């Protein structure tokens, strides 16, 4: 199809405080390095985490990092904290239409 | 690959250009990390870059003097050592004035090596001066493009000091190793061979100087405003990356083409045609680029193709007009125009755009290109040959 | 200094009708920045709805193109989203976000507002 589709394999991911987690984003088409990562806390609108698939903003903690290119992207949360648990989406802005990921919710293991 | 073949020395000059291109075209990557250790972004790192660009106006003339007198070997060694000692430690300095001093040292070395490569190309190809100058200028334009992602990775992982150190060492060592090899075909002053001071008396020099300065001035704002205008239109990010790559590739590749074109027809006619097309394209750029991604990329390609050719048209013109023997000093005096243009180009493009509109900004760039076109078409051809006044023993 | 985005105009409206969402902006001019409307499905799925650029050029995805119209008021710094021919799929919460700076590289949605809810169903 003409529209690009970003698929996050993990609909649900369970982790513990202090560990390392990685949310993966697989694109149907090559989007280079024009990919962003957003974090949506349950009661608030999404907050921008990663732009250009490798760069975080000022005020974004050093725990979150981004890597990848082409069709494979990864958002790595090292030393996960309690507040880190929220929903993470990947968005490509390489070409129109702009598309979003399915969404990965991070919760503690039951 | 023997010594004495002209193309071997042309390849060596292109290699020197590719080795010194890192100082100018890698600066965007180092600007933010170097700033992070220091104070204000716009002040510290950008003034360091501006000083490194301005110092070339005095660096290249003296290096050209020493090249015309004592050959290119020792001056190229000195320029390579200067690039080494300046660019290597820019990541290990803790004070802003030290950064200024080291960046000026590196920029002066780069200016010297650029002048040396251009003079070697012009001397070894007197019949194809335009083509050799274009190849060397393209090598200076396209030098760092292959290794830009690699140096970005080095900056991301191993740090700023390590990246500066690696790049400075590689550049200095390679330039110095090339310095051992290059040589000139053979001083004999002739009637048409002008001294730098004697050149500074002719009106033709100043007409060409104003044309080159206007071209560089308009080009600074053209590069500064082209891609951000595409972002202001709302084009996709991939389209903007393609546009950046097209800008770089065409600004590089147009130089040997325009050099050959000037060889086939002439310096002044080629300058007039190229600058007129560039002025028209820059005047029509805001309107035509709105038509979409394809129009934006086509306008970028055509505009940069018509803008980049000056760096090949002017060296061959200088060698043809003001003599080959003293040509190295004279082309440094011509390089002073590009050095001077960098004084204002810091935030001038963005200022003009955000203040008076994108259309008026590109109209000003087109007016600069049209000044160059008018000088090339109506002013300079009517003067004829330089007169060589006030000669001294 | 701080960037503020206030969404308003959300409601409970019958399908096939009109609505107008307003986004009050503060701290930046609409000229040198781009603005976008993005809605989130009640199943927490995000769909980019509209994006108006620095110059005023508008982009819509084919799913919601033609029905919706994104515009702006530079004099009062308000981003307007006119909605018409409302469908059952249009039930979502809309947010207005500012895009990249004209001379800067960034994502199309740098800062987000609170968000306003638009529901078009049998209720």
SS3 B361: helix
B290 touches chain C (CB under 8 A): yes
Domain count of the fold of chain A: 1
Do the beta carbons of residue B209 and residue B122 sit within 8 Å? no
Residue of A nearest to B153 (CA): A54
Domain interval for residue C53: 4-120
Q: Which stretches of chain A sit within 8 Å of chain C by CB? A: 3, 36, 38, 40, 45-48, 51-52, 87, 89, 91, 93, 96-100, 102-103
CA B369 to chain centroid, in Å, comes to 17
B41 touches chain C (CB under 8 A): no
User: How many other C-beta atoms are found inside a 10 Å radius of the C-beta of residue B348?
Assistant: 17
Q: What CATH number is associated with residue A86?
A: 2.60.40.10
Cα distance between residue B65 and residue B70, in whole Å: 9
What's B385's DSSP letter?
Answer: S
Q: How far is B354 from chain C (nearest CA, A)?
A: 8
What's C119's DSSP letter?
Answer: B
> Virtual CA dihedral for B199, B203, B206, B211, nearest 10 degrees?
-130
Neighbouring chains of B at 3+ CB pairs within 8 Å? A, C
Q: List CB contacts (< 8 A) between C105 and chain B.
A: 237
In a domain, A65, yes or no: yes
Query: Cα angle at B368 between B48 and B53, to 5 degrees?
Result: 15
Cα distance between residue B329 and residue B307, in whole Å: 24
User: Contact B236/A31, CB-based, under 8 Å?
Assistant: no
* Burial (Cβ within 10 Å: 0-12, 13-18, ≥19) of residue C26: exposed
Task: Point out the residue among C105, C111, C113 whose CB comes nearest to the CB of A52.
Answer: C105
Domain count of the fold of chain C: 1
Cα B188 to Cα B124, B194, B253, B324, B326: the distances in Å are 17, 11, 36, 10, 10
Question: Which residues have CB under 8 Å from A10's CB, separation 6+?
Answer: A23, A24, A104
Q: Which of residues 214-243 of B touch A (CB under 8 A)?
A: 236-239, 241
φ, ψ for residue A54, nearest 5 deg: -135, -10
Q: List CB contacts (< 8 A) between C57 and chain B.
A: 233-234, 290
In a domain, A84, yes or no: yes
From which experimental method does this structure derive?
X-ray
Tokens of B84: 């080494």
φ, ψ for residue C99, nearest 5 deg: -85, -160
User: Contact B228/C51, CB-based, under 8 Å?
Assistant: no
Size of interface B-C (CB pairs under 8 A): 34
Cα distance between residue B52 and residue B129, in whole Å: 28
Cα distance between residue C39 and residue C8, in whole Å: 13
Resolution in A: 3.3
* DSSP for B291-357, written as a single string: T-HHHHHHHHHHHHHHHHTHHHHHHHHHHHHS-STTHHHHHHHHHHHHHHHTTTTTTHHHHHHHHH-
Q: How many CA atoms lie within 13 A of C11 on its CB side?
A: 12
Domain interval for residue A82: 6-108
Q: For the stretch A68-98, what's the b/e string if a residue is b when 16 or more beta carbons lie within 10 angstroms of its beta carbon?
A: beebebebebeebeeebbbbbbbbbbbbbbb
Residue of C nearest to B231 (CA): C102
Of B341, B138, B342, B361, the closest CA to residue B228 belongs to: B361
Give the residue before each break in chain B, using a C-to-N cut-off of over 2.5 angstroms; say none if it is continuous.
Answer: 186
Cα distance between residue A97 and residue C61, in whole Å: 6
Task: Point out the residue among A87, A96, A98 whose CB comes nearest to the CB of C44.
Answer: A87
**Terminal CA-CA length for chain B:** 42
What is the Rg, in whole angstroms, of the alpha carbon atoms belonging to chain C? 14
Task: Return binding residues of B for oxalate.
Answer: 338
Q: What CATH number is associated with residue C58?
A: 2.60.40.10
């Amino acid at each position: 199809e003409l529209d690009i589709v970003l698929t996050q394999s993990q609909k649900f991911m369970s982790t513990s405080v202090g560990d390392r987690v990685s949310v993966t984003c697989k694109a149907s088409q090559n989007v280079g390095t024009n990919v962003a990562w957003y974090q949506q806390k349950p009661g608030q609108s999404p907050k921008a985490l990663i732009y250009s698939a490798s760069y975080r903003y000022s005020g974004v903690p050093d725990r979150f990092t981004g890597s990848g290119s082409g069709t494979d992207f990864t958002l790595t949360i090292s030393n996960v904290q309690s507040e880190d648990l929220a929903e993470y989406f990947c968005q490509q802005y390489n070409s129109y239409p702009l598309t979003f990921g399915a969404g990965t919710k991070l919760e503690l293991k039951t | 690959g023997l010594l004495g073949n002209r193309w071997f020395y042309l390849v060596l000059a292109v290699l020197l250009m590719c080795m010194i291109s890192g100082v100018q075209y890698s600066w965007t990557l180092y600007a933010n990390p170097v700033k992070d250790n220091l104070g204000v972004s716009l002040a510290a790192v950008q003034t360091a870059f501006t000083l490194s660009q301005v110092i070339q106006a005095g660096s290249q003339p003296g290096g050209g003097y020493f090249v015309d007198k004592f050959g290119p070997r020792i001056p190229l060694m000195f320029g390579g050592a200067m690039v080494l000692a300046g660019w290597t430690f820019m990541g290990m300095v803790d004070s802003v004035p030290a950064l200024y001093a080291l960046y000026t040292l590196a920029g002066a070395g780069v200016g010297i090596v650029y002048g040396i490569a251009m003079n070697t190309a012009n001397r070894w190809f007197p019949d194809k001066r335009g083509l050799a100058s274009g190849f060397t200028a393209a090598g200076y334009g396209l030098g760092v493009l292959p290794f830009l992602p690699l140096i970005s990775s080095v900056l991301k992982v191993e740090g700023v000091g390590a990246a500066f150190m690696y790049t400075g060492l590689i550049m200095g060592i390679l330039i110095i190793l090339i310095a051992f090899v290059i040589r000139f075909p053979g001083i004999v002053v002739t009637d048409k061979d002008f001294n730098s001071g004697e050149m500074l008396r002719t009106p033709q020099f100043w007409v060409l100087w104003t044309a080159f300065f206007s071209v560089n001035f308009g080009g600074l704002l053209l590069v500064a405003n082209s891609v951000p205008y595409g972002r202001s239109l709302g084009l996709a990010a991939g389209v903007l990356t393609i546009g950046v790559s097209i800008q770089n590739l065409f600004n590089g590749g147009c130089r040997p083409f325009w050099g050959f074109v000037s060889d086939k027809i002439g310096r002044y006619k080629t300058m007039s045609v190229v600058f007129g097309i560039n002025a028209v394209v820059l005047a029509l750029f805001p309107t035509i680029a709105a038509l979409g991604d394809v129009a934006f990329i086509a306008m970028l390609a055509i505009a940069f193709f018509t803008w980049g050719g000056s760096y090949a048209l002017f060296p061959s013109t200088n060698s043809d007009i003001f003599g080959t023997a003293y040509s190295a000093r004279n082309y440094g005096f011509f390089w002073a125009a590009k050095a001077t243009a960098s004084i204002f180009g810091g935030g001038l493009g963005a200022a003009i755009a955000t203040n008076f509109g994108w259309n008026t900004a590109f109209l000003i760039t087109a007016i600069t290109s049209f000044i160059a076109f008018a000088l090339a078409t109506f002013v300079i051809p009517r003067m004829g040959r330089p007169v060589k006044k006030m000669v001294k023993l | 200094l701080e960037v503020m985005l206030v969404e308003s105009g959300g409601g409970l409206v019958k399908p096939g009708g009109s609505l107008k969402l307003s986004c009050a902006a503060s701290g930046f001019t609409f000229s040198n920045y781009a603005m976008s409307w993005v809605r989130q499905t009640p199943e927490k799925r995000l769909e980019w709805v509209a994006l108006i650029s620095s110059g005023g050029y508008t982009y819509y995805p084919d799913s919601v193109k033609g029905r919706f119209t994104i515009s702006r008021d530079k004099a009062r710094n308000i981003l307007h989203l006119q909605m018409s021919s409302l469908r059952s799929e249009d039930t979502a919460m809309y947010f207005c976000a500012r895009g990249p700076y004209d001379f800067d590289d960034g994502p199309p949605f740098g800062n987000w507002g609170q968000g306003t809810l638009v529901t078009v169903s049998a209720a």
